[PDB]
Amino acid sequence: VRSMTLGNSTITTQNVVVGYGEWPSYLSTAEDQPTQPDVATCRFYTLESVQWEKTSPGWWWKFPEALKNMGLFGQNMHYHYLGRAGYTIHVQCNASKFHQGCLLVVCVPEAEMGCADTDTTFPATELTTEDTPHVFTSDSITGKKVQAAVCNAGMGVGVGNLTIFPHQWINLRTNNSATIVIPYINSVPMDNMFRHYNFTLMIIPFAPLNFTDGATAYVPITVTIAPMYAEYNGLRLA
Amino acid sequence: QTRHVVNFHSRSESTIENFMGRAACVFMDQYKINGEETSTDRFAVWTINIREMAQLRRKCEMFTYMRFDIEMTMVITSCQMPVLTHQIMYVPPGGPIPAKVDGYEWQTSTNPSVFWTEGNAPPRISIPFISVGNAYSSFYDGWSHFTQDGTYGYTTLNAMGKLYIRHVNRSSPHQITSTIRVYFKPKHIKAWVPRPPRLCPYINKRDVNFVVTEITDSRTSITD
Amino acid sequence: QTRHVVNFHSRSESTIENFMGRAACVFMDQYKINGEETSTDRFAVWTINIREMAQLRRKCEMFTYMRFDIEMTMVITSCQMPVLTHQIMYVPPGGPIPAKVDGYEWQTSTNPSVFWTEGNAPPRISIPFISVGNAYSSFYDGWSHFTQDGTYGYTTLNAMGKLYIRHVNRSSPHQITSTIRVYFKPKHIKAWVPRPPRLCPYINKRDVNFVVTEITDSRTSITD
Amino acid sequence: GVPVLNTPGSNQFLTSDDYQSPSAMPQFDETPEMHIPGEVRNLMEIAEVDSVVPVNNVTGKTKSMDAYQIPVGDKTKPIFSFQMDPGYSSVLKRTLLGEMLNYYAHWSGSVKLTFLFCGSAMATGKLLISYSPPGASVPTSRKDAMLGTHIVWDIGLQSSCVLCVPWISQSSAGYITCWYQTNIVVPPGAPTSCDVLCFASACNDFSVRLLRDTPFMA
Amino acid sequence: GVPVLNTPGSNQFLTSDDYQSPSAMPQFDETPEMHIPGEVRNLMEIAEVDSVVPVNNVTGKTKSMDAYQIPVGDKTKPIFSFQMDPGYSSVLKRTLLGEMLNYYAHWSGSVKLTFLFCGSAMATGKLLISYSPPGASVPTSRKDAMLGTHIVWDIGLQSSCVLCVPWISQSSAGYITCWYQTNIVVPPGAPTSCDVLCFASACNDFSVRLLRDTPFMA
């Protein structure tokens, strides 16, 4: 049991999957000069806990803008139009000893998702609802929204071989916590934080939750994101 | 066939340059020589992109980011005269395009073009890594216009240019209908961030939309 | 489009040789093969000068003085036979010119000429720095004839020569109308004395005359 | 000048050549290469990544995520059974392993399988994972599977048993059957029916030779 | 002789090649190069030269020299304001800077601005020159401009204030507004209304990549 603290946010934790074997880092020019906030920003932003029942198909969050209303990070998104960060993501499950199940906690950089009924697009509020997650579906759906059927998560790939990305299994038999570090994967050193979704944290239950008639009918999944090494553009003159 | 002892140890064919760097025909198109002075059927266009045919698109979607020089060689035929000379004008991403076969854009000094006359070896034109960013992005989970406007999934970093092709002969006594076959080839290719293979069939050439497909082919029971 | 982080540090494309040294088509012209034994429509002329088309002229007027070798490659077509052979005769500034397609000047040993037959690679002829002075002058605030006579702004130092082009075939059963496209290219170019860019549109190809144009596009107020 | 003579093969266009292409933009200087995380420098780095294998791909459970779940909790018939060849096998053909191998005609190597038991932390039982050589016939009973190659995988102690199946190549393969050694013993509080996930990748190193076009795309 | 074979791309004419052209006048020896003053060896040596910027380019003042004059001498609306991008901006598109940048598609660098106050030697006042980042909105008031980036430029002390605006590139830009901190204080002898000239060049070094044809010529 390790009680991590960052700033004015302390969580209680119980091995880290460093995404692509690199730890996030700063970009290191007078023509373009970054600003490193360091203060705040790096604290833990615990999202709303998500209840995982027997019939839950999955969830996804789209970062960096899932934190668009989360304190100083969410506020520096509005004053700087360029930025980058690292996002340590803790995912606890705090189930009991008699609950069973298994989760795939994967980050999937550049998750371009497909519309439900092709030949058209979706109204941009279907990919993300800031803090709250968009759930997947168990079967096919229609309408101007994301094709959120599992087995074809979002991108038209098999959902089983979604393990190529930075992932972690949460098998309630053995463990309950996951932690992933995603060192800002992008083709340009800095990019706008409202246009571009750098990665898509999606939690997908492979083995469904199961229990008997006495336990709690759900297992709350807690998501915590710590934006590390966030740096922005300069606002001062040169 | 029979199961033989396939005994060897090699992964030189599995490298990225030995997997992606293969020439494939990506653009057939017709273009006449005479008649209809204001027509769009006297030249070819083909905006250069990897999402041309599904067989190569599938390979480009193994990886999120990749950068590579392209070296295309055209194979130009003709039907129905003099000896014919062609022009394959590559315009960069920032470049004016012709509207007619006799536009002024064809004479732009910043648009490199080959003048291949018939009978010789096929014309080969090589284009370096043009993109503004540091790699071409196969996927772009983002919006071109800020504040979640239209045009999802299209970034302007992975723009490669266009390829305008015409006869340079002003006219002809009879009709000559030329056919061009552009052979695209990645070169000096690097690739980042692997990605699971495509499962569903492709719908359209500018989006990732799909129909929900089964994972694998079904069998009768779990034990047969 | 969207505003991306255009992060790089390079000025190799801004050098003079990477700015001026680009081939541009500067002369289209027709010339027949037979008929009208005394006619001016059986050969081409094009007195070589930088003031051909406004797009390249504008670039040459960035600088007052410049010196450069020129390396032009012609692209010759034909319409309507045997296999055709052409002749591209470059006469120096001090050189006799033909008056007809069958003049004796075509046989002058001091006028270098290429004999390109149809079907091969395009003919390429390179001309060194011919001028009497030490650089070609884009602008000449002076008078050719002493004591302020006529012909303002024309010096004889920036004379480059002429380019007479004909068929070498004496006749043909039918009419053949060839088209030539001269691709001018500065080479090994140096430039002195920078100069502000042209603002007004061009009027004539031998003078600097202009119509008074506005500085910039107008807006509503000083503060919008 | 230099007396040259053109050989047969001059002025042709061989599709697969590696000649120096004349660059169309010589003045142009391309963007400097930054370091982007996660470079791939060989395709067999994708095959070495584990990924879930749809063993329960029966006729009505392939468009849901019930394809990946092996139901555990009749001891006379095996739990699951499938050909051990990533090509031409419905179970292992759309795996990362099985999908980077359909780009090639000649491939040979080994393949490791991980069986993650996704049941309760109180459920306890034994499963017997038998392997048949590529020429042998499948075991029809549990005893006949015990007399061959097997691993009695105690679930109560470890929850993940790893294999490494050799002699996997094409240019009549093995079998990974699984048996109830014991039933799943469970306390009154925990549920009775559990699931077992499977995985597949390249075990140590994988050999692969002749590139071709994939059959899946039409 | 030497067995050669022609590759694809033989006997073609690529417009942008750098091959050895056979010289038509080989005997001819060209004129010796004298030293002529003022050699240009890079185009970005033209962009680094300051030049007057027509800020007051309103609908009827662009064919006169009133375009270059910013009238100084109402404190609620700013004196002047313009996009900070030498391309696609009416104010900075025909500057030496803005004109050597329309020959190119990809350019990135910084830009310095000099504000020469061309008033009397007795006129004294303060101007507040605010800069908005490329994502931010313009200040609607003088206080809101004071809370961002600004430089309270005292005219009575110095008559030329220099900026250096970074993050200037294309492949939604900044703003240089100016405000009346104080009015222009003037003795009885000197005139009341003054002018402010502006300048623009490359601040330290400028990056520029993809050559194209200029839009201005038709």
From TrEMBL, chain A:
According to its UniProt record, where is this protein located?
Host cytoplasmic vesicle membrane; Host nucleus; Virion
Which positions does UniProt annotate for guanine binding?
Answer: 23
The record's subunit annotation is: Capsid protein VP1: Interacts with capsid protein VP0, and capsid protein VP3 to form heterotrimeric protomers. Five protomers subsequently associate to form pentamers which serve as building blocks for the capsid. Interacts with capsid protein VP2, capsid protein VP3 and capsid protein VP4 following cleavage of capsid protein VP0. Interacts with Viral protein genome-linked and with protein 3CD.
General function of this protein: Protease 2A: Cysteine protease that cleaves viral polyprotein and specific host proteins.
Q: Which family does it belong to?
A: Belongs to the picornaviruses polyprotein family.
Instruction: State what protein this is by name.
Output: Genome polyprotein
